[PDB]
Design a protein around this ligand. Structure first.
Ligand code: NAP
Ligand code: 8CV
Ligand code: NA
Length: 159
């Protein structure tokens, strides 16, 4: 199955720069636990944002242009990206907006973090209708000494 995992601030704004509001320790821990030892598909700009391969995961980068880092696996289409994952239980799509838009219709699961912070951004998680998805896990969390904003985790399964 294909899953999307994303962290959404207000208005569905997304980002993966190492700065607030995208570096909440609780969300980094959630991302690690739900992606470890699974292939991760990302777009070229998300690859540039992360700045290095994610350890313990097969890293698959979407780009229309030849790859620029042989440590990871580069593909030129959605179908190629999926094929590069092989026969595995779960493929994790980790961004960004353009990539989420294409894989959302192919996804069986959504792993969403909602962050109670306003941030300016040009990129958003795609709109989806809660109607087509069943919430199978949900937990709200307050801000604390490690996490400067409140946030919530949910896992949604396609009905
Ligand atoms: N300055 C600009 O013109 C510009 C444009 C877009 C994004 N950005 C920056 O990137 C941020 C995030 O954009 P984003 O989240 O949409 O990026 P993203 O999804 O992480 O990466 C998108 C890139 O992935 C590749 N890609 C996506 N779908 C593909 C497909 N079907 N086949 C082949 N390659 C595919 C393309 O790379 P290639 O470009 O290598 O083909 C595309 O430009 C923006 O907020 C902005 O900071 C800048
Ligand atoms: N943005 C996501 N794909 N999911 C998510 N919940 N948080 C991302 C956390 C993150 C991991 C690695 C590098 C930078 C940021
Ligand atoms: Na799991």
């Amino acid at each position: 199955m294909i899953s999307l995992i994303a962290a959404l601030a207000v208005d569905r704004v997304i980002g993966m720069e190492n700065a607030m509001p995208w570096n909440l320790p609780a969300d980094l821990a959630w991302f690690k636990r739900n992606t470890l030892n699974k292939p991760v598909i990302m777009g070229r700009h998300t690859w540039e944002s992360i700045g290095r391969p994610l350890p313990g995961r097969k890293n698959i980068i979407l780009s229309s242009q030849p790859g620029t880092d042989d440590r990871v696996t580069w593909v030129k289409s959605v179908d190629e990206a999926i094929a590069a994952c092989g026969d595995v239980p779960e493929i994790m799509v980790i961004g960004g907006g353009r990539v989420y838009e294409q894989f959302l219709p192919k996804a069986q699961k959504l792993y969403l973090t909602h962050i109670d912070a306003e941030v300016e951004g040009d990129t958003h998680f795609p709109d989806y209708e809660p109607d087509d998805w069943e919430s199978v896990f949900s937990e709200f969390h307050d801000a604390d000494a490690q996490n400067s904003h409140s946030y919530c985790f949910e896992i949604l399964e396609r009905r």
